[PDB]
Amino acid sequence: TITARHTQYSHAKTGGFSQTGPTLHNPYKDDPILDRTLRRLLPESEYMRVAADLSKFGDRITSEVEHLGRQAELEQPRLEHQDAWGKRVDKLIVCNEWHKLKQICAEEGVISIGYEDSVDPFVRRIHQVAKLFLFSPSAGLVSCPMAMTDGAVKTLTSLNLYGKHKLATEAVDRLRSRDPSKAWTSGQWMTEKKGGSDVAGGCDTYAVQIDKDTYRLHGYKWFSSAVDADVALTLARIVDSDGNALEGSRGLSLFLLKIRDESGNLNGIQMVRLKNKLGTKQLPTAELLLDGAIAERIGDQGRGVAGISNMLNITRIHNAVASLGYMRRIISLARDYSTKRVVFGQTQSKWPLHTTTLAKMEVDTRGSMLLLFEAARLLGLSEAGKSSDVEAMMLRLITPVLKLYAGKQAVPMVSEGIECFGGQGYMEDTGLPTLLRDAQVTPIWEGTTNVLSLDVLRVFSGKENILLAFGKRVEQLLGNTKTEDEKLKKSKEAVESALKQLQKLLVKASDSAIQGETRIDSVARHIAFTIARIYSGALLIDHASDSSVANQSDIEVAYRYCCEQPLIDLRWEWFASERVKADREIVFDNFT
Amino acid sequence: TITARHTQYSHAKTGGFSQTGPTLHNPYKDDPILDRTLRRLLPESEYMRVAADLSKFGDRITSEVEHLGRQAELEQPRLEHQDAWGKRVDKLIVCNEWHKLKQICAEEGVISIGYEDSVDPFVRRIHQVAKLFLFSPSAGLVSCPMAMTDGAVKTLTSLNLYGKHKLATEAVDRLRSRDPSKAWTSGQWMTEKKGGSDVAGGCDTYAVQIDKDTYRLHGYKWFSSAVDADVALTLARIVDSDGNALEGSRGLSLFLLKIRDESGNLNGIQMVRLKNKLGTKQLPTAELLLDGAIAERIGDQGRGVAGISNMLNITRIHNAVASLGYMRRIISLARDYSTKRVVFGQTQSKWPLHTTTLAKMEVDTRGSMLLLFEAARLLGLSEAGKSSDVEAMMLRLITPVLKLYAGKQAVPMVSEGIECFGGQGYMEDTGLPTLLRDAQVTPIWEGTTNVLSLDVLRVFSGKENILLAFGKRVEQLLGNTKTEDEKLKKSKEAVESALKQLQKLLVKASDSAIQGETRIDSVARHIAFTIARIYSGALLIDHASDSSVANQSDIEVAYRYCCEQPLIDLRWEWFASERVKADREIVFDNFTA
Amino acid sequence: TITARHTQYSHAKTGGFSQTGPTLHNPYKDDPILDRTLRRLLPESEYMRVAADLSKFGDRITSEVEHLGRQAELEQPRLEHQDAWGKRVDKLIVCNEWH
Ligand SMILES: CCCCCCCCCCC(=O)SCCNC(=O)CCNC(=O)[C@H](O)C(C)(C)COP(=O)(O)OP(=O)(O)OC[C@H]1O[C@@H](n2cnc3c(N)ncnc32)[C@H](O)[C@@H]1OP(=O)(O)O
Ligand SMILES: CCCCCCCCCCC(=O)SCCNC(=O)CCNC(=O)[C@H](O)C(C)(C)COP(=O)(O)OP(=O)(O)OC[C@H]1O[C@@H](n2cnc3c(N)ncnc32)[C@H](O)[C@@H]1OP(=O)(O)O
Ligand SMILES: Cc1cc2nc3c(=O)[nH]c(=O)nc-3n(C[C@H](O)[C@H](O)[C@H](O)COP(=O)(O)OP(=O)(O)OC[C@H]3O[C@@H](n4cnc5c(N)ncnc54)[C@H](O)[C@@H]3O)c2cc1C
Ligand SMILES: Cc1cc2nc3c(=O)[nH]c(=O)nc-3n(C[C@H](O)[C@H](O)[C@H](O)COP(=O)(O)OP(=O)(O)OC[C@H]3O[C@@H](n4cnc5c(N)ncnc54)[C@H](O)[C@@H]3O)c2cc1C
């Protein structure tokens, strides 16, 4: 008999402390302003229906969707070119959770709700955009195929193809389907190696006619996301009976195709590789080599850029939803964590420096959230056939302004947000860095900040009616100000003074006399930013001025937004042609 | 015989175009302001020696170091707890290129230059800081152990241990060695699960006396970077003969230890795991369980935090170097790409909106760069015993202001830079996203933005009149303004105005304290940023005013920095305690409690 | 207008041959001696019940189980000692197909 050795088997001791991490609360109920915004925008009976759907979905997010989106990051997509026996197969391997998320989008009507024929288009885009906002930061980038799917439905519908074109009619029905066994998603293959931003210049895919409006496509698609989708829209140059094609925009035609044939093989397509991306790693983005891909021409020949133009309001809107969802999500988690993390003897929530940093993030977020809902409201009105001329013009203006502004807010805000967790915010296993890496896609794809800033200029150039309409919309918003509150009065005076200074600069910039020494393109971003802030400020004031829903937070936020940061940051001397040569000397000093 | 089948074997055709990526040029030669700045700060003689070293190193960066740093990201460190036969070994597997980078740091005197006895201290810190600035964005995060190594040397020499204390003396000699076969690196183990910002409340490591000043450590280190290092400094609570210890800052003492013993075995340490990090993936960062780690107490008992202060400050300057390194790198790469990428029929570089966006990044980067070199200057003067009272105060003030400000500039600026490449900027296999992921460490470690803003306030709280001193420094810089250039006159009046307004605000805040309705802590970041911008502007003006080296871009940059952004953004009402209540109501609206 | 470039986009040609791999047949039906052996060992009555079960299972093997077993090799188990917040959890991660 021996001494027993049970004392020689002992788990490590590590002090017994471990920090509780942030909790994700139902994102409908927890959101500072979503429910109040919906209450103002929708009729009470619709509001009750919408809020009940959204609240229930918010519990699905916490109980199910968040975990699924996390798995889709943990088990990233792979591609196998060949099987084991020497046959080219292009096998895409995607986790089960990616598929489950797609199914959930169908069941929840993330597309459907936007087009439901029995609901007022006004109401349905507001409901839809709200639902998309709850989904996005938990979606594992299923948000991307939802965006392109909504885009596709919009494009095919606007081209008057429904009940006229067989493939387009099946696509619309299936893209809109709530049955997860039948529903489809769409991709959008526009970006090529020579350009993305510039498709008229960069697109080098050719379409050879097979029969009537059926063509075979030959080209190289440089970024093609959601290659597990069912159909795609793309652009190509039709080749004439002489073997020739046209350069530029008027050479481009729009096509619809199925990605895989009846037996699940790729339709004239090879996946050259999957991209290795900073973020959106959940999402399969491939390079595609098209060699004989069978596709149907849709819309008029030479008018493919106009054809895809139908989609820009709604794609721009989904991308802003995503920027805002990451901004809201980091704030939501950071404020929760602030109540559980003790530093210097009390929780972070109690240190005024901490709440000062978060309060400013909340102010800026709220602004752009209202801008988002203004865009949703305008889109719905346009789809109901109920827009005033001012509302139709604000739909064209707001979509690029919203996208670029929220896109440019997103990374610095998320970056600030992760720092609220200290070193933990930098740890991938927390899930927090995903928010930053994924938010960084938002100012880049579907147009960069600067490309969209130029689009804004184009919306209005030179024709002063867009700016006069913007002026009328702001005036409508400020007309409801509760000027008996000194903060809201000051806020309104600040918005008016910014809009007047904007209008004076743009009139002065358009003076025929000074075309030679003026470069409005140079200050495009400044111009777009100033629109965004004036518009968002006027919306915050209106919101705060509605006694039936506003609280004291709403007034203070309107005040801070309007009065504690510049609404306009734009000086006449920045328009000068000479300023450019000085910018170039700054940038290229000692360049080799 | 058959028809031959050569036509049936054929590579894919893919259109024939592909885009040329950006080129990294010699970063000393290609830098907009580094060489001009060294010409001004250094004596003419030292200038030549220093610039030849840096220029040569720049070719080493492009020819060798960059590729090495890239490799260290592609083959990240791994940890194996056990061998195959049931023995716990804690084997850290790091790529050959990580090791090669450390060797190059020794050979190149990235540490040594800062301490070389034959060279004037003011010169050598300028030289050292410039060299670190060239190294940092290609370093594969070898910059991190270089920071900690420099901080360790400073700490150990400041405590007057060199020539007295056995381990500290060996450590100093090895940490400074240019011999890659002998050189050492250090770590710094402060952060624990309960707190990193707050080590007084967070630290739960205990030190049990073995003999005289040698102790056994027992604790859990929650973040320990560069666990391939040879030594580390750490804090622990000394246990008295009754088995008790003191809570709070006053219970902490400083310790120096060897990470591995003479057999290469861990010294009472187990590596629990490696962190899985957003960036700095090149760097091995572990959690450490200390159970009987042998360590030597240094400095006075109870004054560990004060003892470790030189490490915090040196590492905070290195961290600013890294922030600025990422900012300059992205701008260098983006500007080169602009000459090669055609969009809408011409190169990005020809489009005014593209140059407006980059020009602003350049203006902001130059200001922080001059602040960095003013910190290097002030550090050198302090180490030479040549600091005026004002220069000593400005060293203590500038260190956290610089770190936190460049820190907070870095992610938005590198984000803007990656967008210049469009979708390609988001592709990991370009190397560009690394710059963003890595730059994101810089506002977090060695003190968050806010925590350092609070250190700025600790600076004002001792003390002597830090604000007066700051006003004196700014006026030195502004005297010799070339008021004869209209843009520089305007720039000067902008800085004076911002300084006068800050002084005024801070005077009101001291006056109102005892009422109990003022919370200067609430606005600590706004105060810190105003200091950064005032100081940076005045430096830019002084730089542009020097007609011996300044070019036209230097004047235009000073003007834009000073007159086209607010230098001060701070209002009296932000100090009020009633505003905190409003902040909470904004932040916690609908919070699920 | 330009010469079209469709001929410049073209999949690789690799000769046109590839070898067919082996086929897994119903392992009850395809086995050389299993069914003959069960016929001898089991009473005639039990034989029928047992062979129908096994034969049906054999089609389940070829249609379902084989692929599942293959997947369990392609996605091998993993162990995570700690969660992201310093708690020891010993989380075993096994593929859905194992379950
Ligand atoms: C975060 C997760 C979920 C949220 C989002 C998920 C998104 C998935 C990401 C997939 C992609 O990145 S797909 C690749 C997208 N590619 C782009 O976005 C390219 C960006 N470039 C531009 O926007 C350019 O400015 C172009 C393409 C519009 C320039 O084209 P053109 O060179 O043909 O320029 P034009 O000005 O000639 O435009 C041609 C026509 O198109 C019209 N058009 C152009 N833009 C618009 C618009 N926004 N609205 C209405 N119409 C528009 C324009 O009015 C004009 O019509 P007409 O004047 O002939 O009637
Ligand atoms: C990118 C490549 C570039 C390379 C950079 C690589 C970095 C490697 C990463 C490693 C880390 O993150 S290591 C852990 C970093 N941890 C921190 O930075 C700590 C953050 N927290 C603080 O700074 C806090 O303010 C405290 C820890 C220093 C709080 O300490 P206490 O609670 O003891 O606060 P006290 O104010 O009582 O400080 C105690 C004494 O220490 C003094 N002290 C505190 N801070 C300083 C300082 N910065 N300089 C001089 N003295 C200082 C203070 O004046 C005082 O002196 P006396 O009045 O007693 O004489
Ligand atoms: C993760 C990911 C997935 C994607 N998936 C898809 C997809 O499924 N389908 C698809 O079609 N595309 C996709 N894209 C591509 C995306 O739409 C392009 O990256 C984007 O349109 C930018 O184009 P580019 O990459 O060609 O950038 P470029 O145009 O080469 O470079 C952009 C830079 O050039 C500047 N620039 C461009 N034009 C001008 C101008 N006129 N004036 C001043 N500056 C200008 C921009 O401002 C920016 O600084 C994806 C991209 C990413 C990152
Ligand atoms: C890659 C990486 C490597 C690291 N390597 C090392 C290493 O080798 N050695 C080491 O010692 N440390 C290391 N760290 C840790 C680092 O120093 C800490 O993460 C950092 O100091 C923040 O402390 P924390 O993580 O405890 O965050 P916390 O202090 O828990 O939280 C930070 C947040 O709390 C706020 N906060 C804290 N105090 C206050 C206050 N008084 N008032 C208002 N707000 C406050 C901050 O502003 C920020 O918003 C590393 C970190 C990382 C990310």
Curated annotation (Swiss-Prot), chain A:
Effect of residue 425 to R: In n5877; suppresses the defects in egg-laying and response to reoxygenation of paqr-2 mutants
Comp. bias intervals (Polar residues): 5-23
Binding site for FAD: 188-197, 223-225, 341, 348-351, 419, 423, 446-448
Molecular function terms from GO: acyl-CoA dehydrogenase activity; fatty acid binding; nucleotide binding
GO terms, biological process: adaptive thermogenesis; fatty acid metabolic process
Annotated keywords: FAD, Fatty acid metabolism, Flavoprotein, Lipid metabolism, Nucleotide-binding, Oxidoreductase
Result when mutating residue 73 to K: In n5655; suppresses the defects in egg-laying and response to reoxygenation of paqr-2 mutants
Pfam families: ACDH-11_C, Acyl-CoA_dh_1, Acyl-CoA_dh_M, AidB_N
Record region (Disordered): 1-29
Superkingdom of this protein's organism: Eukaryota
Gene induction: By heat. Two-fold induction at 25 degrees Celsius compared with 15 degrees Celsius.
Phenotypic effect of disruption: Temperature-sensitive mutants in which embryos develop to adulthood at 15 and 20 degrees Celsius, but have a poor survival incidence at 25 degrees Celsius. Mutants have increased membrane fluidity and abnormal compositions of fatty acid species.
InterPro entries assigned to the protein according to its UniProt record, in alphabetical order: ACDH-11_C, Acyl-CoA_dehydrogenase-like, Acyl-CoA_Oxase/DH_mid-dom, AcylCo_DH-like_C, AcylCo_DH/oxidase_C, AcylCoA_DH/oxidase_NM_dom_sf, AidB, AidB_N
EC number assigned by the record: 1.3.99.-
Binding-site positions, substrate: 197, 249, 316
Job description of the protein: Promotes adaption to elevated temperatures by regulating expression of the lipid desaturase, fat-7. Binds selectively and with high affinity to fatty acids with chain lengths from C10 to C12 and prevents them from activating fat-7 expression mediated by the nuclear hormone receptor nhr-49, leading to low levels of membrane lipid desaturation and membrane fluidity for adaption to heat.
Subunit structure, interactors included: Homotetramer; dimer of dimers.
Family in the record: Belongs to the acyl-CoA dehydrogenase family.
Protein's recorded name: Acyl-CoA dehydrogenase family member 11
